[PDB]
Amino acid sequence: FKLLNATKLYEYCLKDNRRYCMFVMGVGLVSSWMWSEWWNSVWRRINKGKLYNDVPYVYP
Amino acid sequence: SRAVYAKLWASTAQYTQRRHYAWYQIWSRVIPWSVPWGIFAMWMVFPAMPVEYRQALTFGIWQKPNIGTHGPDP
Numbered sequence: 001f002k003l004l005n006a007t008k009l010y011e012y013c014l015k016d017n018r019r020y021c022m023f024v025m026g027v028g029l030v031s032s033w034m035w036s037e038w039w040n041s042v043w044r045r046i047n048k049g050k051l052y053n054d055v056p057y058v059y060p
Numbered sequence: 061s062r063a064v065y066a067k068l069w070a071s072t073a074q075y076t077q078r079r080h081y082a083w084y085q086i087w088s089r090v091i092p093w094s095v096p097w098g099i100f101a102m103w104m105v106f107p108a109m110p111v112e113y114r115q116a117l118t119f120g121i122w123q124k125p126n127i128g129t130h131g132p133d134p
């Protein structure tokens with residue numbers, strides 16, 4: 001709690017509700033995309049050699 | 061005295077100017093709400109734009125998701 005209070009996130013971004021909303025919207029925007037790309041990478045990591053890209057078709 | 065009554069009468073002559081000042085104050089308090097809602101507008105309308113414009117507006121950070129399909133054909 002001392003660490004968090006030292007970052008002064010409350011003073012600058014959460015004590016005023018207009019800024020609270022700005023924070024919510026922007027953090028949403030960025031976090032969603034990071035989460036998405038991370039799950040993409042996991043989905044490619046677990047399924048290696050099973051997906052379409054990993055095993056090209058070779059013509060006869 | 062005429063002088064004092066004149067001053068008291070004149071105290072409110074500039075009603076319209078004070079009302080313009082009030083307009084200014086309330087709009088200054090209100091207008092920052094445009095930023096949250098602006099971000100959300102852009103959030104919703106970003107995937108409607110051309111792929112090139114998505115790449116440009118994010119300074120090249122955004123790229124087509126990689127889900128392991130529709131790769132090149134030799």
Ligand SMILES: CCCCCCCCCCCCCCCCCC(=O)OC[C@H](COP(=O)([O-])OCC(O)COP(=O)([O-])OC[C@@H](COC(=O)CCCCCCCCCCCCCCCCC)OC(=O)CCCCCCCCCCCCCCCCC)OC(=O)CCCCCCCCCCCCCCCCC
Nearest residue numbers: 029030031032033035036102103106107116117118121122
């Ligand atoms: C970690 C520890 C844990 C902590 C825990 C703490 C607790 C909190 C949790 C935190 C942990 C993480 C949690 C994960 C959260 C995130 C995941 C998440 O939320 O996903 C949700 C997830 C959403 O997934 P998705 O939507 O598929 O995600 C796709 C992505 O969003 C992909 O979509 P996209 O890519 O299409 O997105 C587009 C995006 C794309 O985003 C990007 O690409 C942005 C890139 C971001 C980069 C990041 C930067 C920051 C990092 C930098 C590093 C700094 C370095 C310094 C520091 C280090 C070094 C010192 O772009 C935008 O948004 C628009 C751009 C910006 C707009 C603003 C305009 C700016 C203009 C720019 C001007 C400048 C000039 C430009 C012009 C060019 C010329 C000059 O949920 C779902 O999938 C849905 C669930 C189903 C539920 C439905 C809901 C209910 C509905 C029912 C309602 C019906 C009932 C009635 C009503 C009921 C009412 C009650």
Ligand SMILES: CCCCCCCCCCCCCCCCCC(=O)OC[C@H](COP(=O)([O-])OCC[N+](C)(C)C)OC(=O)CCCCCCCCCCCCCCCCC
Nearest residue numbers: 097098099100101102103104105106107108109110111112
């Ligand atoms: C006050 C605001 C009220 C907002 C109410 C609006 C709610 C209904 C929104 C419908 C949007 C439909 C857009 C038409 C274009 C086709 C969409 C589509 O599916 O395209 C294919 C695309 C995908 O394309 P594709 O892969 O199918 O192929 C076509 C490729 N492009 C798009 C490049 C041509 O699908 C989407 O991305 C879904 C559309 C998301 C857009 C959502 C827009 C929301 C609008 C709200 C903004 C409000 C801001 C405030 C404004 C107030 C001003 C006074």
